[PDB]
C-alpha cells in the first residue's frame, strides 16, 4: 500500500525580522540560483554597512581670523546632531533605525601659511564644557594644531554616554560636543591673508543598529 502524497496544509516562512504562518501553503518555486558572472561589472568592494556608514563625511567648517581673542570660541559643534540630516546618503541608515551606538573618529585640518603663526586646540568633550574651566581642556583627548609643525590631527574616541545607546528622534543630550578654541591668537604680517580656513571630518566605528521602524516618517 503506497500512500498518495499528502498536501501540506501548514507551513511557516520567515526572513530577517519577519514571520508568516500560512494554511494555503505549498513548496517554494526556485529557478536557477545565485551566480557569479566572471566578467565583473564594477570591481569595487560591493556596498555594505562597512561600505557606507563607515566612511568619512565633511561636517562643518569655519574660517579663523585674527580678531578672535584668547579662547574666543571659533567652533562649537555637535557630532551627532549634524550627521543626521537630509544631505547625506548615510542618512539612510539611521533614519530607519531607532537605536544606534558607535565609536567616533575625527579629522581636523587647516593650512596656515608658514609666515602666519598661532595655534588651535581640538577637544572632544562629552556633554558640555559646562563650568569646567577652560584651562584644562588638554585633559580630554585632543591634539594641538600648530602653524609650525602639524597641519593635521586625528582623534579617536569609543562610545561614552550615560544610557544604553543614543536615540535620534528624541536625543536626551548631545553625546560628543566638539569644541575648538583659539589657543594662541593669529598674528600676521602685512599683506598676508589675515584669515585661514578650518575643516572637520568624522566617521562611525563598530556601528551597530537596532529597532527598524517606519515611524521616522
Amino acid at each position: 500500500e503506497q500512500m498518495i502524497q499528502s498536501v501540506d496544509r501548514t507551513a511557516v516562512t520567515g526572513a530577517s525580522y519577519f514571520t508568516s504562518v500560512d494554511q494555503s501553503s505549498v513548496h517554494t518555486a526556485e529557478v536557477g540560483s545565485h551566480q557569479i558572472e566572471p566578467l565583473k561589472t564594477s570591481v569595487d568592494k560591493p556596498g555594505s554597512k562597512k561600505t557606507q556608514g563607515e566612511k568619512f563625511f565633511l561636517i562643518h567648517s569655519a574660517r579663523w581670523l585674527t580678531t578672535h581673542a584668547l579662547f574666543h570660541e571659533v567652533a562649537k559643534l555637535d557630532v551627532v546632531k549634524l550627521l543626521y540630516n537630509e544631505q547625506f546618503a548615510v542618512q539612510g541608515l539611521l533614519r530607519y533605525h531607532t537605536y544606534a551606538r558607535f565609536g567616533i573618529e575625527i579629522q581636523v585640518q587647516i593650512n596656515p601659511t608658514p609666515f602666519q603663526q598661532g595655534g588651535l586646540i581640538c577637544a572632544m568633550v562629552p556633554g558640555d564644557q559646562s563650568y569646567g574651566s577652560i584651562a584644562s581642556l588638554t585633559v580630554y583627548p585632543h591634539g594641538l594644531l600648530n602653524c609650525n609643525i602639524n597641519n593635521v590631527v586625528r582623534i579617536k574616541v569609543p562610545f561614552i554616554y550615560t544610557r544604553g545607546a543614543y536615540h535620534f528622534k528624541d536625543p536626551q543630550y548631545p553625546v560628543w560636543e566638539l569644541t575648538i578654541r583659539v589657543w594662541s591668537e593669529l598674528n600676521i604680517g602685512t599683506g598676508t591673508s589675515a584669515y585661514t580656513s578650518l575643516n572637520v571630518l568624522a566617521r562611525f566605528t563598530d556601528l551597530e543598529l537596532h529597532g527598524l521602524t517606519p515611524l521616522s516618517t
Binding site: 503506497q2 498518495i4 502524497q5 498536501v7 501540506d8 516562512t13 520567515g14 513548496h27 526556485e30
Partner: protein, 260 residues
C-alpha cells in the same frame, strides 16, 4: 542559509531545461501491474508537479529509425531563414537596414515570418550570427558591404541613398568588396560586438530603440549606371553553436506572425 531564507517546508526547482532528448531511444516494459499512483496529483507545489506522469500500461516505445535529430535547437536553426529583400532604381547609392529583434517592429520593416516567430521564445540572446546575401539580375556590378556596430554614426535605416561617410570611415570598419559577376552569393559570420551583456527582443518603448538592435548593415553598389536590368537582393540568417540562449518565454499569438 547565508542568504537568510528561513523556512519549514522544502525548497525546490521548476522547469529545468532540456529534461529529455528529442529522439526516441533507449539512452523491459515501462509500467504496469505495479501501481499507477502518479495519475492523481495536485499541480501546484512543483514537487508533485515534478512527479513522472503515469496513466495506463505502456511498452517502451521502440526506437527512432534515423539518427538525424531535429529537436536540438542548433540542428534546427542551422537551416537559414528569409530576412529582408529590396531593390535599386539607381546607380552609386547605398541602402541600409538594421537587424533588430524588435517584436513591435512590423515587417516589411522588421523581422518577418519565421524569425519574428523565433526570437520571441526567449528573453536573452548572445553570440555570433551568420549573414548570407544573394544577388540577382545584371552582372559586372560591384558592391561593398560594411558592418556597423550599434550606436556609431550611421545613415538612416530602410533608405536607398548616397552616404555622407568617409570612404575611409567606411572601409576601416571591415568590408567585403565583390563582383556580381564571378560569384554573386556570400556567406560571412557576423561578429558579436556590443556593449550589452546580451540582446533581447521582448521590449517596449524606450529600450526597444536600443537593446533590440543587434547591429546595422549597409550595402552600396557601383557601376549600375545603365538603369535597365533590374537588380534585387535577398538575405538569410542562421546561428552557429557558439551563440547561446537563455530563459524561455511564452510564444507569440497568432496575430503577431506576419509574412511577405
Amino acid at each position: 542559509d547565508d542568504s537568510g531564507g528561513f523556512s519549514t517546508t522544502v525548497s525546490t526547482e521548476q522547469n529545468v531545461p532540456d529534461p529529455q532528448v528529442g529522439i526516441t531511444t533507449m539512452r523491459m516494459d515501462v509500467s504496469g501491474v505495479q501501481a499507477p499512483v502518479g495519475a492523481i496529483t495536485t499541480i501546484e507545489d512543483p514537487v508533485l508537479a515534478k512527479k513522472v506522469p503515469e496513466t495506463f500500461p505502456e511498452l517502451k516505445p521502440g526506437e527512432s529509425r534515423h539518427t538525424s535529430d531535429h529537436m536540438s535547437i542548433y540542428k534546427f536553426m542551422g537551416r537559414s531563414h528569409f530576412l529582408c529583400t529590396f531593390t535599386f532604381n539607381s546607380n552609386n547609392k547605398e541602402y541600409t537596414f538594421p537587424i533588430t529583434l524588435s517584436s513591435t517592429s512590423n515587417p516589411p520593416h522588421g523581422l518577418p515570418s519565421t524569425l519574428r516567430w523565433f526570437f520571441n521564445l526567449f528573453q536573452l540572446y548572445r553570440g555570433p550570427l551568420d549573414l548570407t546575401i544573394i544577388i540577382t539580375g545584371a552582372t559586372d556590378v560591384d558592391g561593398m558591404a560594411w558592418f556597423t556596430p550599434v550606436g556609431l554614426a550611421v545613415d538612416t535605416p530602410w533608405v536607398e541613398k548616397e552616404s555622407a561617410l568617409q570612404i575611409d570611415y567606411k572601409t576601416a570598419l571591415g568590408a567585403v568588396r565583390f563582383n556580381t559577376r564571378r560569384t554573386g552569393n556570400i556567406q560571412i559570420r557576423l561578429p558579436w560586438y556590443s556593449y550589452l551583456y546580451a540582446v533581447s527582443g521582448a521590449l517596449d518603448g524606450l529600450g526597444d530603440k536600443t537593446d533590440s538592435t543587434f547591429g546595422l548593415v549597409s550595402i552600396q553598389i557601383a557601376n549600375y549606371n545603365h538603369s535597365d536590368e533590374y537588380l534585387s537582393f535577398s538575405c538569410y540568417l542562421s546561428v552557429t553553436e557558439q551563440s547561446e540562449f537563455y530563459f524561455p518565454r511564452a510564444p507569440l499569438n497568432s496575430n503577431a506572425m506576419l509574412s511577405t
